[PDB]
Amino acid sequence: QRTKIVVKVHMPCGKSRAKALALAASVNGVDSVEITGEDKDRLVVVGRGIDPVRLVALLREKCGLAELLMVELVK
Amino acid sequence: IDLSRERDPNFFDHPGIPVPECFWFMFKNNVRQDAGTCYSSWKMDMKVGPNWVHIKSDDNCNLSGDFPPGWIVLGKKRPGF
């Protein structure tokens, strides 16, 4: 039930950027968090058990903007 | 659109998990919007313009899904895959 989730998160700084990481990585079931993207505005979250609606909603309130980009169950 | 011409996405393959076989590329009116990796012979959900779209991959990374007008997501197998 491992899945990869990519979220677009408002994080201009490196410091709201570390805010987002540690927050995504505090979520139950997460295995890794990486930031990617030409604009480094993507959180990649991997784990099993994760509610994507909960991931985004949390990042939303705590960073202001978050939209789901992709959810891919690990083959 | 020419996938053989497109630069590789920004990817990081996590050491524990199986290495996805495909690059996908997402275009709005033939302009590259995003790119990434996904599994072949599989399935993902993706934000494509305004819509959350369910996408199937076949074993040669052909992506199929019901994309909104002006948008498309295209695949190919990564090098050596």
PDB file of C-alpha atoms in Angstrom, chain A residues 2 4 32 34 36-38 42 44 46 67-75, chain B residues 7 10 14 17-18 21 24 34 37-40 42-47 52:
ATOM      1  CA  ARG A   2       2.991   2.241  -0.525  1.00  0.00           C
ATOM      2  CA  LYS A   4       3.888   8.296  -4.024  1.00  0.00           C
ATOM      3  CA  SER A  32      10.583   9.957   2.510  1.00  0.00           C
ATOM      4  CA  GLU A  34      11.905  15.243  -1.246  1.00  0.00           C
ATOM      5  CA  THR A  36      11.749  18.700  -6.671  1.00  0.00           C
ATOM      6  CA  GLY A  37      10.696  20.955  -9.499  1.00  0.00           C
ATOM      7  CA  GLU A  38      12.353  23.608 -11.619  1.00  0.00           C
ATOM      8  CA  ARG A  42       6.978  20.332  -5.211  1.00  0.00           C
ATOM      9  CA  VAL A  44       7.286  14.352  -3.120  1.00  0.00           C
ATOM     10  CA  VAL A  46       6.216   8.374  -0.226  1.00  0.00           C
ATOM     11  CA  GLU A  67      -2.630  21.357  -4.551  1.00  0.00           C
ATOM     12  CA  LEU A  68      -2.382  17.662  -5.339  1.00  0.00           C
ATOM     13  CA  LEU A  69      -0.410  16.964  -8.507  1.00  0.00           C
ATOM     14  CA  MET A  70      -0.205  13.196  -8.628  1.00  0.00           C
ATOM     15  CA  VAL A  71      -0.869  10.070  -6.628  1.00  0.00           C
ATOM     16  CA  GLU A  72       0.727   6.856  -7.826  1.00  0.00           C
ATOM     17  CA  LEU A  73       0.504   3.658  -5.943  1.00  0.00           C
ATOM     18  CA  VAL A  74       3.840   1.872  -5.992  1.00  0.00           C
ATOM     19  CA  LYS A  75       3.664  -1.024  -8.494  1.00  0.00           C
TER      20      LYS A  75
ATOM     21  CA  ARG B   7      15.005  17.040 -21.883  1.00  0.00           C
ATOM     22  CA  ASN B  10      13.937  16.164 -12.681  1.00  0.00           C
ATOM     23  CA  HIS B  14      14.112   6.342  -4.005  1.00  0.00           C
ATOM     24  CA  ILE B  17      11.189   1.208  -4.185  1.00  0.00           C
ATOM     25  CA  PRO B  18      10.954  -0.330  -7.672  1.00  0.00           C
ATOM     26  CA  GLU B  21      10.055   2.575 -16.171  1.00  0.00           C
ATOM     27  CA  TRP B  24       5.761  11.290 -18.637  1.00  0.00           C
ATOM     28  CA  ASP B  34       5.548  19.280 -16.225  1.00  0.00           C
ATOM     29  CA  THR B  37       8.338   9.291 -13.801  1.00  0.00           C
ATOM     30  CA  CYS B  38       5.660   6.646 -13.586  1.00  0.00           C
ATOM     31  CA  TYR B  39       5.290   2.915 -13.774  1.00  0.00           C
ATOM     32  CA  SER B  40       4.632   1.060 -16.976  1.00  0.00           C
ATOM     33  CA  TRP B  42       0.138   0.616 -14.389  1.00  0.00           C
ATOM     34  CA  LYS B  43      -1.924   3.599 -13.446  1.00  0.00           C
ATOM     35  CA  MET B  44      -1.762   6.989 -11.752  1.00  0.00           C
ATOM     36  CA  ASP B  45      -3.958   9.951 -10.909  1.00  0.00           C
ATOM     37  CA  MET B  46      -2.715  13.358 -12.034  1.00  0.00           C
ATOM     38  CA  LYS B  47      -3.782  16.991 -12.072  1.00  0.00           C
ATOM     39  CA  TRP B  52      -7.938  15.129 -11.705  1.00  0.00           C
TER      40      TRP B  52
END
